[PDB]
Design a protein around this ligand. Structure first.
Ligand code: HEM
Ligand SMILES: OC(Cn1cncn1)(Cn1cncn1)c1ccc(F)cc1F
Length: 527
């Protein structure tokens, strides 16, 4: 009888609760372990679900292999399952869609279907501050992107180029890593030099002279603290009572506090011009519903834009130098282009002349092909999504993962994809280019289609707005490096593997190059 069965359930329940504590703990471990395996096996027959990568440890999932070797992971998954597959990652289910159709599925996904801010808020909000970027609705982000873009005009770039050039020269002159007036050769770690050059140049141009001057003080130490909070660990542990987390928060307060002081000081003196992004945001930061950004939110947006731009550009800078260190042929070819465009060095570098340097820009383009600083972009799925031409349905609660950087490294789309060749971009040296219909999400007309196999800057509503600033900064920086120095690897060394575990895919350190002055007698003037 079924009556007597229900009795033995209750009996079994009471015997269960009365087990020796060791077997209880063991059952605490074995039961969800067994349940997990059984759940996957069952999930398999679901043909309205993409294949799920098998994993042994519950919650953890494929985190370790994804965390350490994401492209090798994607490649293995791809030839087993094809272009669409899911995997468990630290409690989340990630649905990957590789290739151009994946680019379309995720970057062009409707606003109602996916949320970037739900994916990233816990990473970024504690670092940047409240009320901006991912700590706000999408419509607010769109307009923040529009506000920042107002300091990213052609006219702005024309003024930034000599400021950036000045900083590069000052760095060559003053940094312990160079001191070109005293040394004709030396060794550097590019993961030391490039983050420093990147912060000095980006500060001077986007933040202005005051904020640049601050980096000549121990205030510079706060950026390091803030920098240390920008880490994937925030995806698991956003806030922990350690000193790492307190130094982060303290820095965000002191740094935004500093920006606010400058802001309120400019407003008090009515000293608001068109010098920098701070000026720009002081004059142009009213949303379409008439609500103004607070001084705090302005400062916080400044932090995030600068920090995001910081890591992508520094990493890219580092890779350019690293690839060129074993390619004296490319160094030579870039140098000839410098001599031609700048009339033997007699012409001062300008933003317009930068545009007349196709090989230089192709080098940047090719470096971003081989080293997309962001190997995975995420969205949280908010409504059930049907996968076109499939029976797959991606349920709300899932995350979608797109990886243009993976496609960058596929021979199908880039022959001999693991060879560095700037000439694969001959007569195709633009940072990117819309060549079909365009669309405006709030921050300017951008390409409607996002099916290009090359997407260093993403696409759709979350597309990068720093692409031309990045080319301007990298361009000026590399133009001066090329014209000033040659460099090569220490004996036996080559391009290092990427460190896929940090927030951007930095080179594994220490990554050293040996530089030498092209003109040992050349001196850099100024104080
Ligand atoms: C080589 C350098 C850079 C690369 C490769 C890059 C790449 C990207 C990518 C792939 C995205 C899309 C992220 C997503 O879909 O989730 C993005 C978004 C964005 N980037 Fe960049 N970026 C670079 C430099 C910069 C710079 C210099 C700035 C600021 C001056 C910047 C600011 C932004 C902003 C404001 C967004 C929008 C985020 C959103 O809408 O959710 N980036 N970038
Ligand atoms: O897209 C990022 C955030 N992110 C996503 N994965 C890793 N970091 C990075 N980024 C893109 N360009 C520059 N940085 C971002 C976007 C906007 C922003 F203001 C900061 C920021 F970190």
């Amino acid at each position: 009888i079924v009556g007597e069965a229900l009795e033995y359930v209750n009996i079994g329940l009471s015997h269960f609760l009365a087990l020796p504590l060791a077997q209880r703990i063991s059952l605490i471990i074995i039961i969800p372990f067994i349940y997990n395996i059984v759940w996957q096996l069952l999930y398999s027959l679901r043909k309205d679900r993409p294949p799920l990568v098998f994993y042994w440890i519950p919650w953890v999932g494929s985190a370790v292999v994804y965390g350490m070797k994401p492209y090798e992971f994607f490649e293995e998954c791809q030839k087993k399952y094809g272009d669409i597959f899911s995997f468990v990652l630290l409690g989340r289910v990630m649905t990957v869609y590789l290739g151009p159709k994946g680019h379309e599925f995720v970057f062009n996904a409707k606003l109602a279907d996916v949320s970037a801010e739900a994916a990233y808020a816990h990473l970024t909000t504690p670092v940047f501050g409240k009320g901006v970027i991912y700590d706000c609705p999408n419509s607010r982000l769109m307009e923040q992107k529009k506000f920042v873009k107002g300091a990213l005009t052609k006219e702005a770039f024309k003024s930034y180029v000599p400021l950036i050039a000045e900083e590069v020269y000052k760095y060559f002159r003053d940094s312990k890593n160079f001191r070109l007036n005293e040394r004709t050769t030396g060794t550097i770690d590019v993961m030391v030099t490039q983050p420093e050059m990147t912060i000095f140049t980006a500060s001077r141009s986007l933040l202005g002279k005051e904020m640049r001057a601050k980096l000549d003080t121990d205030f510079a130490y706060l950026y390091s603290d803030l920098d240390k909070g920008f880490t994937p660990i925030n995806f698991v542990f956003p806030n922990l009572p350690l000193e790492h987390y307190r130094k982060r928060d303290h820095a965000q307060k002191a740094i935004s506090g500093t920006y606010m002081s400058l802001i309120k000081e400019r407003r008090k003196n009515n000293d608001i011009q068109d010098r920098d992004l701070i000026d720009s945001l002081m004059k142009n930061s009213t949303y379409k519903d008439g609500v103004k950004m607070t001084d705090q939110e302005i400062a916080n947006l400044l932090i995030g834009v600068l920090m995001g731009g910081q890591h992508t550009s520094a990493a890219t800078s580092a890779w350019i130098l690293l690839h060129l260190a074993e390619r004296p042929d490319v160094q030579q070819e870039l140098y000839e282009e410098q001599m031609r465009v700048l009339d033997g060095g007699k012409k001062e570098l300008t933003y317009d002349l930068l545009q007349e340097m196709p090989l230089l820009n192709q080098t940047i383009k090719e470096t971003l092909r081989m080293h997309h600083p962001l190997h995975s972009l995420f969205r949280k799925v908010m409504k059930d999504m049907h996968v076109p031409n499939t029976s797959y349905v991606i349920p709300a609660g899932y995350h979608v993962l797109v990886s243009p950087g993976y496609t960058h490294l596929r021979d199908e789309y880039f022959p001999n994809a693991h060879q560095f060749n700037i000439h694969r971009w001959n007569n195709d040296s633009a940072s990117s280019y819309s060549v079909g219909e365009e669309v405006d999400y709030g921050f300017g007309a951008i390409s409607k289609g996002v099916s290009s196999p090359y997407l260093p800057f993403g696409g759709g509503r979350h597309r990068c707005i720093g692409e031309h600033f990045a080319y301007c900064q990298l361009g000026v920086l590399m133009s001066i490096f090329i014209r000033t120095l040659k460099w090569h690897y220490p004996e036996g060394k080559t391009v290092p593997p990427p460190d896929f575990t940090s927030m951007v895919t930095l080179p594994t350190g220490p990554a050293k190059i040996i530089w030498e002055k092209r003109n040992p007698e050349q001196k850099i003037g100024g104080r």
